[PDB]
């Protein structure tokens, strides 16, 4: 299962990360 980021289509890691198995440079 992909991360809500790639799943949903619109990442939302602006501020704090909550989702699991992430891989964004805006959080990581
Ligand atoms: Cd993200
Ligand atoms: Cd994240
Ligand atoms: Cd994510």
From Swiss-Prot:
Q: Where along this sequence does the record place binding of a divalent metal cation 3?
A: 13, 17, 22, 27
Q: Key word Nucleotide-binding present in the record?
A: no
Top-level taxon in the UniProt lineage: Eukaryota
Q: What GO molecular function terms would the record report?
A: metal ion binding
Keywords, ordered alphabetically: Metal-binding, Metal-thiolate cluster
Q: Which family does it belong to?
A: Belongs to the metallothionein superfamily. Type 1 family.
The domain-related comment in the record is:
Class I metallothioneins contain 2 metal-binding domains: four divalent ions are chelated within cluster A of the alpha domain and are coordinated via cysteinyl thiolate bridges to 11 cysteine ligands. Cluster B, the corresponding region within the beta domain, can ligate three divalent ions to 9 cysteines.
This chain's protein is named Metallothionein A
- The species this protein belongs to is Notothenia neglecta
What gene makes this protein?
mta
């Amino acid at each position: 299962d992909p991360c809500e980021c790639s799943k949903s289509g619109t990442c939302n890691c602006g501020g704090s990360c909550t989702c699991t198995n992430c891989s964004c440079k805006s959080c990581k």
